[PDB]
Amino acid sequence: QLAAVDIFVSTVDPLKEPPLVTANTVLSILAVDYPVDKVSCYVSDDGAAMLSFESLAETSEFARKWVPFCKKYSIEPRAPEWYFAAKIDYLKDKVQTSFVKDRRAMKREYEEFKIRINALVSKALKCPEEGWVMQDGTPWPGNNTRDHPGMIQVFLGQNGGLDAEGNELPRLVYVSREKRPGFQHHKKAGAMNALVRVSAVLTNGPFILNLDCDHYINNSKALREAMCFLMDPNLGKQVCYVRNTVFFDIGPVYVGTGCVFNRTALYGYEPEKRFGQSAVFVASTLMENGGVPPSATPENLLKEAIHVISCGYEDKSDWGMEIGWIYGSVTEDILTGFKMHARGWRSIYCMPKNLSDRLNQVLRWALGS
């Protein structure tokens, strides 16, 4: 049995971070070998760059061609750029199947895409003094970076999309938490706690996979292998595979990029409570390993996802808390990453890319610092 997983990807600024690079990571996630209803992709853009938003839409719309291709022909790796970069052997077969026409078109599709992405960054460069207007005419809610409402936009999923062969793709969620002058947002950490919460009130996945914007999934079967190793008992703490895999087993430990951990361990309990004032959030707290209560209404939980990235949602709220993701006080100490606990039985599956001290350093690389 495979449980749903929510994969995280955070963004700060598209001109420091090439959309095309992060776009490749998102297409490797949308193409993963895993039930579409049990993988959800949440992309935070803490800058609120219209450019991030638009590139994310172009990517979502290219993914409708790309995912079925990757899935018909067992393409690996699931990121176009590196794939169309790898060597292929034309000499192997004596006859031309449809892969020839199909691969030649998909590559032409990919260059079309890069060009269209390039054109978006070309237009993001000259900044109009009167703010950003979207392609459809509508003004961008994010012209002021420190003053804008919370934004949530779903792509593909069960209500949009449909790849060209008529099947539905993983949900793709642009999130951008609220910014109002006067609220410390905890930049990268605040994005991530908020992102833990918004993904809880929507697709409440029992497992979470934060990925850096450039950490594309190399093996499309990563979550299948993850899942069948994440759920069974044995002894011994860390094991190693053949960059490569790790997978732990059996105080607090802090985990970051590129690791598949269970959601409940962020919460302190084993599924009064101050996770904030959202009872929908605390519902998903006490629910099963994951899942969203069927007693919940699409309009009411969009109402709450907006609520749970609002400004001041974390006020006195015990976030950056003794659990979850934590921050080190003014002038930024380094005390970061997610947090789990005595854990009872828990394990974690990561795919990275003195005696005790030298071992403590590598068992930190495997958790993405």
- From the N-terminal CA to the C-terminal CA, the straight-line distance is 31 Å
Oligomer: monomer
- The beta-strand count equals 9
Q: What is the helical fraction, as a range of percent?
A: 25-40%
Q: Compute the number of helices.
A: 9
Q: What is the number of domains?
A: 1
Radius of gyration based on Cα positions: 21 Å
Helices and strands: which structural class? alpha/beta
The run of helices and strands is EHEHHHEEHEHEEHHEEH
Morphology call = globular
The biggest sheet, with number of strands, parallel, antiparallel or mixed sense and barrel status, is: 7 strands, mixed
> How much of the polypeptide forms β-strand, as a percent range?
5-15%
* Main β-sheet, spatial strand arrangement: 3-4-2-1-5-7-9
Binding site for UDP-alpha-D-glucose: 10, 16-17, 46, 187
Subunit structure: Homodimer. Interacts with CESA1 and CESA6. Interacts with STL1 and STL2, but not with GOT1. Binds to CSI1 and CSI3. Interacts with PAT24/TIP1.
Function: Catalytic subunit of cellulose synthase terminal complexes ('rosettes'), required for beta-1,4-glucan microfibril crystallization, a major mechanism of the cell wall formation. Involved in the primary cell wall formation, especially in roots.
Family: Belongs to the glycosyltransferase 2 family. Plant cellulose synthase subfamily.
